[PDB]
């Protein structure tokens, strides 16, 4: 079992979610996050205070899938979330041990 995390630009959420729905993946979790990197927030001014560097709103997507699915999921999200500009995002992959559905008690594959 694999767990794929994707950090992207907020407006490109609906496209990725629909790219995931194309391959039968409707189950997913989303978190509002703040990011910093090569691309950064515009200067901020508050009376006397001036903060030249700021954080930028981003979106973190979490999806549990199967090993065989890993190949397609990476390729489908990579294109769907692409815009060309700096700050497009990154794809993280990690090994998931056991997945359990609370409602029924189902395991790994049947839990999704």
């Amino acid at each position: 079992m694999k767990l794929v995390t994707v950090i992207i630009k907020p407006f490109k959420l609906e496209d990725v979610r629909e790219a995931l729905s194309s391959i039968g993946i409707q189950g997913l979790t989303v978190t509002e996050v703040k990011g910093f990197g090569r691309q950064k927030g515009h200067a901020e001014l508050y009376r006397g205070a001036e903060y030249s560097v700021n954080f930028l709103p981003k979106v973190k997507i979490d999806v549990a899938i199967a090993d065989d699915q890993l190949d397609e999921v990476i390729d489908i999200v990579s294109k769907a979330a692409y815009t060309g500009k700096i700050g497009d995002g990154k794809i993280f992959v990690a090994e998931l041990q056991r997945v359990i559905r609370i409602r029924t008690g189902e395991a790994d594959e049947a839990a999704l």
Binding site: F11, E14, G41, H42, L45, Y46, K85
Partner: protein
Amino acid sequence: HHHHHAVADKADNAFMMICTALVLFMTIPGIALFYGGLIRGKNVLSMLTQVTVTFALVCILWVVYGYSLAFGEGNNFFGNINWLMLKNIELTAVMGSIYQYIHVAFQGSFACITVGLIVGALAERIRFSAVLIFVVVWLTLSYIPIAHMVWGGGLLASHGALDFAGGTVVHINAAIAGLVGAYLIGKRVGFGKEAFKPHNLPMVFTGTAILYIGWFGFNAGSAGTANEIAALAFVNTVVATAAAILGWIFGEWALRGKPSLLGACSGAIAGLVGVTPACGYIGVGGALIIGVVAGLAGLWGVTMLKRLLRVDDPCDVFGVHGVCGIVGCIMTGIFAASSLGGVGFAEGVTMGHQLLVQLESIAITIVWSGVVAFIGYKLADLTVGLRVPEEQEREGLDVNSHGENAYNA
């Protein structure tokens, strides 16, 4: 007896000063919170600042030459410059049963809210500098002449137009101005592809509530004194707003599926706008019919109408202020009739002549504001460019145009 002067009634002075405060309350913060809540978080500050700065700009222009041009003796379209920076107007001068200085401020607050209305149709893609340029031109060439034609003894007033508090002068004027802006600056990025929800509905409600409480000074104050006419306008304001709220709500519940909170709020304005030209001339029953019709009309304005016009008017300035403004002006030339519980038409005027007069005022207002708004937007787009780059639009107007983030830790 040339040295005989009118004495101000302290009661009318008090009433009108308070009413002026109430209309000012409509812009600062009324319309600003109303529109600010309707748009997304990354853009609320852009809205609050546009309204604030356009407010200031109007207040200045109005006292320098604005008031003098709209309410000073002239022809049928413009006034005079005899009252530049209020010179020539003595402090003890009386206009009606109040000091003219109160009249200045009261009429000034009307121009302010008018300009604040337009801004909602331009949200999220317009450049800040552009809005300020458009205002200087539009206020000067559209508001002042229109206000003079209607409330300053000009063309429309001499033809017998009925507009108690600004059906034409304020609402239709603003709605058209906004419609032109929406068309010219184009649809927002992602329109029809992404969800555009109001970031803060409680904020919208607060603005709606403030606009309502402030409106009583807007409609009743148009009486110019705390008399029976003000008592009539006050009562008619309560009635039409409630009727419109109920009109919209039940229209939405039946045709859309449920009674939304935004629906109710939008119904309130619809009823408020619709009764604006009628409030001082119609009976309590007329206000009921107007309110209902206006509410339902507004529902159409933001639903079918908007989709057919194919415009991105984010705060539906036209769907509410244009559709209900036109509806209201027409319904005024009808419900003012004595047999309908109204105050009655002027000596020797029948329903036909009046109705035709109402339509003439409406057409003129639309063409005048539409032409001047087209010119206004052209200069803004010529000097500074009306629309901010795509990249700035996705990131937010707040951080890019005003260097600030609305909600921090």
